[model samples]
Target chain A: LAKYGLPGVAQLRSRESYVLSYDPRTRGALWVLEQLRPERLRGDGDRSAADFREDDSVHAYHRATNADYRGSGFDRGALAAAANHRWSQRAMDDTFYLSNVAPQVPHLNQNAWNNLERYSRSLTRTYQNVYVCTGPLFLPRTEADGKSYVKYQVIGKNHVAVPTHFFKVLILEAAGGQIELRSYVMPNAPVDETIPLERFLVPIESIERASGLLFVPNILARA
Target chain B: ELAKYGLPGVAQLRSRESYVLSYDPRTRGALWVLEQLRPERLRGDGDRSAADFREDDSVHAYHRATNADYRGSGFDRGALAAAANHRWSQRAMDDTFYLSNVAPQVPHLNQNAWNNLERYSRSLTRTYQNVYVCTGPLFLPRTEADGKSYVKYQVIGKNHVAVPTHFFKVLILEAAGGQIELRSYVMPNAPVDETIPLERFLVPIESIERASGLLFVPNILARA
Candidate 1:
């Protein structure tokens, strides 16, 4: 079963349900992968019940300390939110670990990005199973001289990287071994509600080229 | 050639090389000019022709925008019936010199800003095999003297030619393997400094659909 794993910058961290690859410099996961199905989304308790806290399991030397990020304009944004709430009372401890979270703008966490998170959760009703990969993207923007550069802000004493953009790829499974794919990229700014999510649609190859990550590699052979 | 893709599904009229759609009888200008820009079409060895603006004899009496003369009129008679790729021959260029396909534009807006976008459309063919383009006008809402908002656009000449407040271009390019790429822009109908990147005007395609009340592609939206 371990043969299927997410490639990360360093040692892979395993949880009860999802896998993550963490970057010490960014103090965030380079990418997070999780499988979602009907049973996993059947919530047993409320999400508000789980308080966000540091991952004591992480070594103190490499951790993003609570004081460092205290005044930072960030949110306790989760990567695998459906899995975070589906488990029972005490099981949410794994979901709360700092490794599974990243620094995100409060406006983005509550606005357009929030809408996408809800859409991902709603797919449980539309598909038999789904696989999602989400991560920070430092997409390059060309300067006046036409030389391209990738810029991102750093926060906290640990220098947590604030992604300039974010990406989500969904591999949806249907009834008779069928699959559907959709990819999206959104700038790390406040998105207006009037702008349709359809506008953000881009070629999946663009995401792969920009992030240097291949999603559902087997889809190439099957598709 | 514009019909090969799809007509904008309005009051559609055709020339030898492109399509022009009169948005409304009162506006006296085209809602859009549709053209298929391809790399192969750009290399025809002839330069531009010595042509005069002329009324389109093919236009219906009620649909005629004007007499193709804006001489003394404080407006720049802009071309909505031509292509920048030089795909048209001498006869083809004359065919597009119709007042029905012309719009009253502010001078610099037509010569610089909007023209820049038109040229950009042809340059896109250098990368993609084919680029389908639709350029059009936008009439925005404004506050009236009575303090009420109304879709009031300026009218010029006894022919009642309506001036557009802004202009837009929607470009779509498809790779050979069936993947699609889309870019859309809406620029103020005023001079924009050339230093500003064209990317600044980018907006969601849906915004254009909402403003223009036109659908560019039905099949693509269906699959999406």
Candidate 2:
């Protein structure tokens, strides 16, 4: 196998703030996981000090650039929310890589999405440990022809995909050694802020089935 | 430091008697399956009738395709590693039937032009000392009326196995003269007229590399 070399590499980047698996096809992350605690949530990390930059670790052909999002009518939304890793400045900076970002809708990123991130951080006060897994989804929709199709636009010369929706699966560990799972799915468009966060809550299986990722098995084995 | 527990997901690589494949859990199929075709490997009494398509247990149930998914989808469980090429061993040919090595392919193209391309790949063994074939699916984008490009493909069955917009087969030919030749082809998932010359579908290698997010030249040249 070494004679011809590997055609591709499984890009798994580990940073002080979080761990991310990159998807070269989408020019974004397959998933980003981060741990949140009371001490980790309140620290000297300043969001103003961090700036979105291209992840050089990724091949240039597959890497997303700040230029891709410029004038693209989308926000370089962080999958691993920066504020959640305020434990250190460099940890927060690690969340700024374009590989950890997706082209998110402006209203969704600033409003409802931001609310969810804030809500996740608030859980650290109640739970002893909080693990958040976030990524994009290109869900299929049944057209009038009664056939299911997944269709999403690509932005910029690099053609970074605009995910149809996004998912966040939270695994909460309580002081009593009990585990609770809360998974949410939000469309990449305007979401009603008035809608309760509970409204977006969905069964973890749905996320597992739709995202092609298993959360229960990993969490269960740990428990 | 972040992966203290475990990785939630990663592409699965499986090596069989005939080929090595990288399984794409997102597409519910292989990202690419590679096999080396040689004279001896292509000439045996392996029977295709003995092999039946089955789900690969190595893959998670949530991300693997099943025979039921294609029972009436009007698409064939197309083989990326052509079964006939591995006739030297029945187990190798049988390994090609696993769903992980299959993808949703239009019946017309699968049995016609695509099959023709596979046959041509096998025929290369007569000339080249080694024929390394890499086959995989491609979800190429199309320009819409809005002046923007979009990638759209159908998903089949409960597992939501992606129906690729197109398919690609890249051939890396190793000659006995210490020289190498490359050929790459892309065929749409729709019906294609078999009467057209196979060479017409030939495409530049970079196009496949860019679209599939798989590098070939750099890897091949590194060995040189």
Which candidate's lDDT is highest?
Answer: 2
How much is B127 displaced in model 2, in angstroms? 0.7
**Cα RMSD for candidates in order:** 19.6, 1.9
lDDT of 1 by residue, A1-223 (tens): 0011111113367676567666543466667776665554444645444667776655443466666567776776677664434655544556677777777777877788888866777787899777777777665555675433444565554555567788887777788778777787887777774678878878876766555455565554645
- TM-scores of all candidate predictions against the true structure: 0.45, 0.95
Which 10 residues in a row give candidate 1 chain B its minimum summed lDDT? B1-10
Top of the candidates by TM-score: 2
Q: How many clashes does the backbone of model 2 have?
A: 0
How good is the docking of model 1, as DockQ?
0.01
Highest-scoring model, DockQ: 2
Q: Write the per-residue lDDT of candidate 1 for residues B1-224, one digit (tens) a residue.
A: 11111111123345355543534433456666665665645456457767666766665444456653365556788776444544556655665666766777888877887788777777888889677766778765444565433343455554446677787787778788876777889987677776688999999886665456455554454554
Across residues B1-224, which tens digit of lDDT does each residue of candidate 2 receive?
A: 24545677866889999999998888797999988885744335534458789999999888889998888788999999988888777787899999999999999999999999998898898888889999999998889999988999999988889999999999988887788888999999989999999999999998888888889998777777
As for candidate 2, its clashing pairs are: none
